[PDB]
Amino acid sequence: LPHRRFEYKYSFKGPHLVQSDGTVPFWAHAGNAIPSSDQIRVAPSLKSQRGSVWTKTKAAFENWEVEVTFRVTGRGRIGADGLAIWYAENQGLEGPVFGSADLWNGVGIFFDSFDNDGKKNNPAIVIIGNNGQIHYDHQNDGASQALASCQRDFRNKPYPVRAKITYYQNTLTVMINNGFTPDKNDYEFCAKVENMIIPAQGHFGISAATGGLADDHDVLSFLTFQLTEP
Numbered sequence: 001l002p003h004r005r006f007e008y009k010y011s012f013k014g015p016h017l018v019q020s021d022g023t024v025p026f027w028a029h030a031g032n033a034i035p036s037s038d039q040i041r042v043a044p045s046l047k048s049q050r051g052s053v054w055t056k057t058k059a060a061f062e063n064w065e066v067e068v069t070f071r072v073t074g075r076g077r078i079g080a081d082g083l084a085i086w087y088a089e090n091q092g093l094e095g096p097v098f099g100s101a102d103l104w105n106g107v108g109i110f111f112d113s114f115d116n117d118g119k120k121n122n123p124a125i126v127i128i129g130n131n132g133q134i135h136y137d138h139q140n141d142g143a144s145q146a147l148a149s150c151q152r153d154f155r156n157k158p159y160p161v162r163a164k165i166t167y168y169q170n171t172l173t174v175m176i177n178n179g180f181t182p183d184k185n186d187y188e189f190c191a192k193v194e195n196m197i198i199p200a201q202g203h204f205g206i207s208a209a210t211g212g213l214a215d216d217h218d219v220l221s222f223l224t225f226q227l228t229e230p
């Protein structure tokens with residue numbers, strides 16, 4: 001097991017997430033993102049919303065882990081459109097891609113709620129690498145652009161969902177706790193990419209959006225760790 005060192009300057013959590021200025025320390029909020037004390041509501045359950053939180057400053061970690069705790073809540077069996085967890089070269093503030101800009105340099109892990117391509121394969125968790133040249137294909141849930149993916153129902157859980165995403169030794173892994181139980185540490189394997197290269201310095205980002213249907217997408221915490229091989 002690599003040793004995990006916490007990096008607060010790249011992190012946020014309650015019970016006092018928003019400062020009186022309305023800011024969350026070390027992070028920048030844009031669009032329809034709403035910061036509260038317990039969480040950020042990155043997109044509210046309204047039609048056509050885009051939100052996003054990014055770290056102010058770049059990080060140069062050879063290996064890192066990010067732990068993200070969230071909820072996607074909707075009235076109905078079906079919800080839209082999802083979340084995206086980001087590690088890129090530049091903060092991407094506005095885009096068609098879950099509310100963040102298209103043509104990114106880095107990797108986005110997308111928790112896609114809505115079945116655009118009507119394959120009946122949603123909700124899904126997708127991993128997509130990009131070098132600044134790709135254009136994400138929404139209409140297709142980016143099915144053709146995935147490095148890897150899993151199917152996972154992250155909507156309407158009794159407890160918050162958590163995603164543990166690790167870049168260690170050129171491997172990007174995604175573990176999910178499905179919110180079935182109060183046990184925090186109950187992760188199951190969702191997906192991995194091997195031999196993956198991403199930028200040496202980057203911004204850790206979170207984005208959300210809604211279209212014709214909408215859910216509230218809330219992030220309780222974002223915690224970042226640098227990892228060292230021991």
Ligand SMILES: OC[C@H]1O[C@H](O[C@H]2[C@@H](O)[C@H](O)[C@@H](CO)O[C@@H]2O)[C@@H](O)[C@@H](O)[C@@H]1O
Binds near residue numbers: 081138210214
């Ligand atoms: O936000 C859901 C979906 O909304 C829009 O898609 C249309 C299409 O999915 C169907 O005709 C229904 C959905 O109930 O009406 C929508 O207008 C698009 O905005 C799309 O981006 C999004 O996935």
Ligand SMILES: [Ca+2]
Binds near residue numbers: 114116117120121141
């Ligand atoms: Ca699909």
Ligand SMILES: [Ca+2]
Binds near residue numbers: 112115138
């Ligand atoms: Ca989709």
